[PDB]
Ligand binder design. Structure first.
Ligand SMILES: O=C(O)CNC(=O)C(=O)O
Ligand SMILES: [Mg+2]
Ligand code: NI
Ligand SMILES: [Zn+2]
Length: 331
């Protein structure tokens, strides 16, 4: 078995290997990459996502989210308070302000220590889930707006034709902006490209050990667990590396820099934070190996997680028993 310790693998495809997306994903899995739940892909040196970022300040963040924490430094939840709209230019200037900017630090490790010590005491503002793309239409390789769609994958593998579309989303971050512990909707893959700015630190639990993280989360967030049998789908809970180590949960960490892709694999729980002002683009995708994970994916039916139009069909086809109850939650 390849990669039996479930380490995060880093890939360096040549320009030739960067032509066929599906094939390269299947290659990385042949080497065991998926066992970690997360992989990094460094593009060939010839490749670029677009020519410059010189003209992005006019993108609108219609509903910036202030991420307010509650709890203790290593075990907390966050709620998102909606703020008034602002442009990317306005947000970048806010991120760089004295109140929100990255503090002085020695290296990524010192900054990681400062994040876990001090996150809860601040409320950074995140522009998340903004439909759109920053890839130039002429970028033909690994263009996250030109991938094969999940609906077409399900049709190719299973024969069934379904409604729905699959488009990318932009994320504008600042120091301390935080992504809570989660897997993807329907335990899909994700791919995330860091277009510009400061790094993103990731934490991930191997898919084969995901239920260990779930059991710890039920112990650490006991009222949330009583409320919903899949409350990590709410994307609100944080648990630090120190707390994971104290509780024996297997995990790995890695820092993504501008110009790099990350892939998350089905049922790979992940969380993380941004180091400073940045912009990322991400989208879900599927392969043949995902289908079985999609059939088994948990679902939030308490009504909090409230998700896309396209998830309907996935539930209806892959989880017809749950259909009914999940759509009671979704209405
Ligand atoms: O970059 C972010 O804030 C969060 N992204 C993801 O969880 C992802 O790509 O799967
Ligand atoms: Mg613009
Ligand atoms: Ni994710
Ligand atoms: Zn729920």
């Amino acid at each position: 078995a390849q990669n039996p310790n479930c380490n995060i693998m880093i890939f360096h495809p040549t320009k030739e290997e960067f032509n066929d997306f599906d094939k390269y994903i299947a290659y990385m899995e042949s080497q065991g990459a998926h066992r970690a739940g997360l992989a990094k892909i460094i593009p060939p040196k010839e490749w670029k996502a677009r020519e410059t970022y010189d003209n992005i300040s006019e993108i609108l963040i219609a509903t910036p989210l202030q991420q307010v924490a509650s709890g203790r430094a290593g075990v907390f939840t966050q709620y998102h308070k909606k703020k008034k709209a602002m442009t990317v230019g306005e947000y970048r200037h806010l991120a760089n302000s004295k109140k929100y900017q990255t503090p002085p630090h020695q290296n990524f490790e010192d900054l990681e220590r400062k994040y876990w010590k001090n996150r809860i005491y601040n409320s950074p503002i995140y522009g998340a889930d903004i439909s759109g793309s920053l890839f130039d239409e002429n970028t033909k390789q690994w263009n996250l707006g030109h991938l094969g769609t999940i609906q077409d994958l399900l049709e190719k593998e299973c024969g069934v034709v379904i409604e729905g579309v699959n488009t990318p989303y932009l994320y504008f971050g600042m120091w301390k902006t935080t992504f809570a512990w989660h897997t993807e909707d329907m335990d899909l893959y994700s791919i995330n490209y860091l277009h510009l700015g400061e790094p993103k630190t990731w934490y991930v639990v191997p898919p084969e050990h995901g239920q260990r993280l779930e059991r710890l989360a039920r112990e650490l967030f006991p009222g949330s667990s009583r409320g919903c049998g899949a409350f990590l789908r709410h994307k609100v809970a944080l648990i630090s590396p120190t707390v994971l180590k104290e509780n024996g949960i297997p995990f790995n960490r890695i820092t993504q820099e501008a110009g790099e892709f990350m892939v998350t694999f089905p049922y790979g729980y992940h969380a993380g934070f941004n180091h400073g002002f940045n912009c990322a683009e991400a989208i879900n995708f599927a392969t043949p190996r995902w289908i079985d994970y999609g059939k088994m994916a948990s679902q939030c039916s308490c009504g909090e997680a409230r998700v896309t139009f396209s998830m309907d069909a996935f539930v209806r086809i892959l989880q017809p028993e749950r259909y009914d109850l999940w759509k009671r939650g979704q209405d």
